[PDB]
From TrEMBL, chain B:
This is Ubiquitin E3 ligase ICP0. The chain holds residues 610 to 622 of 768 of the full protein. It comes from the Viruses. Residues 1-10 have a biased composition (Basic residues).
Amino acid sequence: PLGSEAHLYMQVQIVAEDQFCGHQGNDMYDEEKVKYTVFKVLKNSSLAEFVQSLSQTMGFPQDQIRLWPMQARSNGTKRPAMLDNEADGNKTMIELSDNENPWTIFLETVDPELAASGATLPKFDKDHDVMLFLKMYDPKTRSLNYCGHIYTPISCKIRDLLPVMCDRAGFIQDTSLILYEEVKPNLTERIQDYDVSLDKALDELMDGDIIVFQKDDPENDNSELPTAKEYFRDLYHRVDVIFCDKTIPNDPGFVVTLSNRMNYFQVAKTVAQRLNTDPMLLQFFKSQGYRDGPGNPLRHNYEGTLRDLLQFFKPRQPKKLYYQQLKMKITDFENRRSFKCIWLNSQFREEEITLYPDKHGCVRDLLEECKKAVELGEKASGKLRLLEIVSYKIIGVHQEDELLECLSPATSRTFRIEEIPLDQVDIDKENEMLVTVAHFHKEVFGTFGIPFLLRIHQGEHFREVMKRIQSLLDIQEKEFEKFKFAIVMMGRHQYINEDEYEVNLKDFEPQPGNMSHPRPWLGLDHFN
Amino acid sequence: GPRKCARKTRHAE
């Protein structure tokens, strides 16, 4: 509901220097936080009109204020601009603004407690002087402190501005400084020579140009952002990211402020700090694209950037990454192999165990991982072995040299760890041997039960072999009498004379010289 | 003597 003459008016927004104090961004203020004094003025009204009106409105003499229209430039900045108050004073408000509606103007005034003390709006020769803005960067707090503005002749040399900078910043005089120009977002160029004049020092010298300076100090290197150049590259690339714990359901998460240019290490460090913990103790997850939730694990050595990780979020969603806190160190967690096998205890019973040696490890390592975990029996050896079983037969015993990479548990029950009995520890090598024993009953492919290694002795006779089997095999004499005992090789078997046959060691050795092929074995014929 | 620039010519977008 505009009404008749609304089109002859324009909004003029006046901003006072106190609005610049506290700003951490580029230029002088954040457009979304700035507080304006607003005027509704005739477009065709004059400059002297607005100036006088403003003087009386604001409680300052007209002689004592200066107007610097705010100018939005193609280089990505909005800066205060020069206005000759007299020369242009009879041009119109809409003219002077180049049809910007609203029009923002920086209004310079005097303190005025300093104005009670006599001070005045300074000399400004629009041809030979320049107004500069001064910002001090403190690397310890990583912040910008607004140091106000100066007037200086153009021909004055940078070195001559150092004491004013030191003063406005609370620095003891003759403190060495690094000066930068803030040209635009993501461009802050160090001023290399202090002994040249302002036209040479600054890129393209204008009123409203910004100088950012800092103490030149070795403690600056302790900061995450040691120079203003770095500080501004950081702020230019800042992005807020919600992190959620994957393990904890439904968790809303916490917001962390990061930079798109950060690598794995940097991100880890920041998130690890907000959780009070080692970054090496975290694992992170990529994104699933359009679905919310955790994607694939992010390797500790990831080469990309946070921008690469965040690239799949659409224009407006919350950017969200999932992590998991780790009981252990991530380079170890990644290389950790989960080896599932059977522990066989002193009671001749099977427990399922999962051990985690290093995947580059060997059998000796897996064994001691298991020995750390279990109670051994009674008197016994305190020495362990690893058997490989397929179809309830032992296909072989494994030596500790063997790399773990040489095994593939095609089945969860393929591998068995067991404590070596005392009679078998160091066997008398000439007159006795170990044989694998398995249960079968119709055929020798008919295998079942728990298989085992048995010691047999040369010239020894079978009945006390049957007794040795007895003591271990848990059960009593009746259908242990069902048992008929065989010697098996490959295809076929034959059943030992249950008496009398006296053990001849190698009715059980393979063809002499042949190791690789599976040995003869002792079969047990019974059902279940 | 030395003078200011009139307009900003570098680093446009």
